[PDB]
Structure 1
Amino acid sequence: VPKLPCRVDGACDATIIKMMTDLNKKGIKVASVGQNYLISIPASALFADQSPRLNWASYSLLNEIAAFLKQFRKIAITVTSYSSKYVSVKRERALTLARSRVVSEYLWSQGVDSRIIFTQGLGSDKPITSYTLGGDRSPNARVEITFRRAV
């Protein structure tokens, strides 16, 4: 026991459940079915109006996200960006790509214990709800982080 670590470093299921509940309370969609894990966040909480930029407060939320992610063991992390239809297809795709690149770069700057990170965005080509009256406030625009438990 003083030689071999009994559990992985900085591990607490209590903390895991606590911050998962906190994220659900704040409204971040957290899904854990099987060994595949998904976390979805509305784009309005992080980016401005179709704007690939970060308000200062969003960094605290990203800090919390990274702290949660630190706990697990993983290999590959996939990040996908979805937006609303604004002018064209290429404009939305480029905005999604830029946002994904930015968030991925900051996550990598953080101690994300992974091996490969894939990033992409698909504008509005994969809708999640027929109702689309709202703009960026609409839930259809979003960002998803997906991965699989690494044993």
Structure 2
Amino acid sequence: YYMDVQEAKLRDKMRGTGVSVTRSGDNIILNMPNNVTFDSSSATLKPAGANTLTGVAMVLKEYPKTAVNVIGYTDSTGGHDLNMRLSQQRADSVASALITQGVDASRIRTQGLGPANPIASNSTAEGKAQNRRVEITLSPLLEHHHHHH
């Protein structure tokens, strides 16, 4: 359980934001289309996206046993290294926004996995557009930080 109610909260808050709530197994995948999060192409937090990121951050405050893995995906047509930069850049923008809103930095990790896992075809522009995305992987804290010794 634990994320059952979170799925309901996210589904309500993302009622018409543009964010696709894909609940995979136990963890929740919040994938945000390039257009709704960023302005042009560079990591640029538009008001709409910042507003939505605030909603995400709110839920992350409601349930602090969430591990926030911000994994950025993207097509690598142009320069896989440059796209890697943008991949990490985009993830970092989301993370810093969360931390700014009040999410623990120690509960957040940013991974640029753009040219790693193709969600769609990379040869076709259809998939190329789909691959360029930011997916927030909300997983339950695998063994909370344990320091009493």
Bin of the TM-score, shorter chain as denominator length: 0.7 to 0.9
Task: Pick one of 77, 82, 99 that aligns with 1:91.
Answer: 82
Measured against aligned partners, the alpha-carbon deviations of 1:71-110 in whole angstroms (never above 9, x if no partner) come to: 2231532110011234111000011111111211111112
**How far apart are the structure 2 equivalents of 1:18 and 1:58?**
18
Q: Does the CA contact (< 8 Å) of 1:74 and 1:113 recur in 2?
A: no
Given that 2:17 and 2:52 are in contact with CA atoms closer than 8 Å, whether structure 1 keeps it comes out as no
Q: Is the 8 A contact 2:87 2:113 kept in 1?
A: yes
List alignment gaps of at least 5 residues for structure 1: 1-12
Q: How many residue pairs end up in the alignment?
A: 137
Structure showing greater Rg: 1
Closer/same/farther in 2, CA of residues 77 and 95 from structure 1, 3 Å limit: same
Once structures 1 and 2 are overlaid, which stretch shifts more, 25-34 or 81-90? 25-34
Question: What is the RMSD computed on CA atoms of the aligned residues?
Answer: 2.9
TM-score of the aligned structures, taking structure 2 as reference length:
0.73
CA distance in 1, matches of 2:75, 2:25: 30
> Which amino acid letter does the alignment assign opposite residue 98 of structure 2?
L
- Give TM-score scaled by structure 1 length: 0.73
Query: 5+ unaligned residues in a row in structure 2: which ranges?
Result: 143-149
Structure 2 counterpart of 1:146, one-letter code: T
Matched, 1:116 2:113: no
Percent of residue pairs identical: 31
Give the match for residue 35 of structure 2. Answer: 44
1:66 corresponds to which residue? 57
Higher helix share: 2
1:96-148 alpha-carbon deviations (Å, 9 max, x no partner): 11111121111111222574321011333321112632597x22211111132
